[PDB]
C-alpha cells in the first residue's frame, strides 16, 4: 500500500513534466506573437507523448572517448535524485515525514550537481568539459547564499520540520516579514535549477550544449526530465516556505488545490523569466551572489536571529 | 488619351512619421516604495509575535498534559 503511494506521486509528477514542456514552448510562443504547438493533438495536448516516443526510439550512442560508466550513471543518478526531492514535501501530508525535511533537500540538491559533473567529464570533449567546470563555478555561487537564507526563514518557524511551514503560516504569508529574503531566494533557486538567466551550463548559444552535448536519445530526455521535475519541485518547496496555504485537517483537498495555483504560478513566472531576460556572465553571475546578495544575507541573518528575541516572539519545539 | 498614371504621394503629404524614442517615467518615487515594504514588514512582523507567543501558550499546555500523564 505504500508502494501505492510512492508509485501515485512519481507517476504524476512525470506527467506533469511532460505537460510543462508543452506549457513552456506555448507560453513563451504566445509573448513572441506566435502560438506553439497546436497541432499534434487539440491544442498540441498530444506533443508531449510524440516527443518522448521519439527520443525513446532514437538510437543512444557511446562516444568513442567517453568513460562508459560515469556516463551511463550520470543521467540515472539525476533523474533518480529529481524523483527523490519530492517525497518530504507536505500537500499537506508528506510522503516520508521528517524531523529534518529542509536539510535533507538541501543535501540531496547538493549531491545532484554532480550528475551534470560526471556527466559533462565522462562525456571527454571540450565543451561538456565547460559545462561541467560552469556548473563548478554555479554551484560555488548560489550555495553558502541559499543555505544562510533558509537559516534566516526558518528561523520564525522553530524547526527543520517541512510540516510545521502549515502551522507557521496559519493567519499570514511568511513572504510579508521577509520579502528580501524571498527575492534572493527567488533568485538562488532560479540559479540553482540552472535556469535562465542563468542557464551557464547548457549554455546553448556559446557552448552548443554544454555538459549534454554528447547524450542523445533517452539518456538525454532523462537529463531533461530532471531539470524540469527540478524546476516544479524548487517552485513547490518555494510556496510552501514563502505562501501558506490554509489547511483543514477535515478536507486536506483545499490545501492541496491552493499549493497546485501557487506551485503553477510559480512555474510560470520561471517560463516569464526566461522570456523576457538575456544570460548573464559565469563570472557576473559569481560576483552579483558574493558581493550583493551575501552581505545582505548575513545582516538579514543577523536581524532574523534577534527579531524574535527582541519581540519576544520564539516559536516553540526546541 | 487618358492622363497619365503612377503610383504617386497623395496631395498635400501624408501624415507625420513617428520616429523619436519614447519611453515613458511611469514609476513611483523611491520613499514610497521603501516606506510601502517596510510597512509590509512591520505588519508581517506584529502578527507573527502574536501568532508565535499564542503557539508558545499552546506547547506548554500539551507539555503540561504529558507531565499530568507522565506518572
Ligand atoms: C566489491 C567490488 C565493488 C563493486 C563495484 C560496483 C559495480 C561497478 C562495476 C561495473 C562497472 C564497470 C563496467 C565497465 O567497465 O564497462 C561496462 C561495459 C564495458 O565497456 P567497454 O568499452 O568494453 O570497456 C570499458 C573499460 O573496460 C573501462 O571503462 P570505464 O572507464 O567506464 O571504467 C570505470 C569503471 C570500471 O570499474 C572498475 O574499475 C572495477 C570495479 C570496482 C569499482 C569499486 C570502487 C569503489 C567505488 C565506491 C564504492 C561503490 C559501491 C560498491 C559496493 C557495492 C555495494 C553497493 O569504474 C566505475 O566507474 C564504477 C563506479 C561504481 C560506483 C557507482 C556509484 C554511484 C554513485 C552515486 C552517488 C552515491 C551516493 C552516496 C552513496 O560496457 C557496458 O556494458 C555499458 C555500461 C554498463 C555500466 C552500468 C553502470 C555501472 C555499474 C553501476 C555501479 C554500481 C552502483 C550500485
Ligand atoms: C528557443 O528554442 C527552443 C525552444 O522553443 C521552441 C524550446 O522549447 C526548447 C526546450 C525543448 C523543447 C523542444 C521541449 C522538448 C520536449 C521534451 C524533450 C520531451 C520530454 C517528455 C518525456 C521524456 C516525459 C516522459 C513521457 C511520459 C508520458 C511521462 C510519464 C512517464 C511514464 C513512466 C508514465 C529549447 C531547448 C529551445 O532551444
Ligand atoms: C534486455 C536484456 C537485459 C540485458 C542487460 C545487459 C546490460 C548491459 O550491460 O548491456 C549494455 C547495455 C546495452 O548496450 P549494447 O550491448 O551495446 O546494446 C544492446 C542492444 N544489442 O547498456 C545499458 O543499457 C546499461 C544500462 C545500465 C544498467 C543498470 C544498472 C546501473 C545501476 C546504476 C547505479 C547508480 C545509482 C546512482 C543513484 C543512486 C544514489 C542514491
Ligand atoms: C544517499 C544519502 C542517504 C541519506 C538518507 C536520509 C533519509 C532521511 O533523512 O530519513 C530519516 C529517517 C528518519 O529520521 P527522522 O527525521 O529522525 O524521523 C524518524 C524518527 N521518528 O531515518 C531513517 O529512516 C534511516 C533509514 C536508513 C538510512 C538510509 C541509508 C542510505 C545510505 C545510501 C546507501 C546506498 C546503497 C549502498 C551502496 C551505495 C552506492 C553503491
Redesign the pocket.
Known sequence: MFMINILSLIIPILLAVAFLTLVERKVLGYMQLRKGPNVVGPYGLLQPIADALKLFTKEPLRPATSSISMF??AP??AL??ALTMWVPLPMPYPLINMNLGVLFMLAMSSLAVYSILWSGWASNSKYALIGALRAVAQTISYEVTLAIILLSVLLMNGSYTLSTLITTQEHIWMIFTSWPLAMMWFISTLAETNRAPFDLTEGESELVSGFNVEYAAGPFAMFFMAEYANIIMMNAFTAILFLGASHDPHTPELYTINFVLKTLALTITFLWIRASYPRFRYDQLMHLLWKSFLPLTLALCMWHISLPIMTASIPPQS | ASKVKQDMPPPGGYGPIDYKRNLPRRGLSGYSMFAVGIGTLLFGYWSMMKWNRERRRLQIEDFEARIALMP
Open positions: 551511463i550513471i540515472i543518478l533518480s535524485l
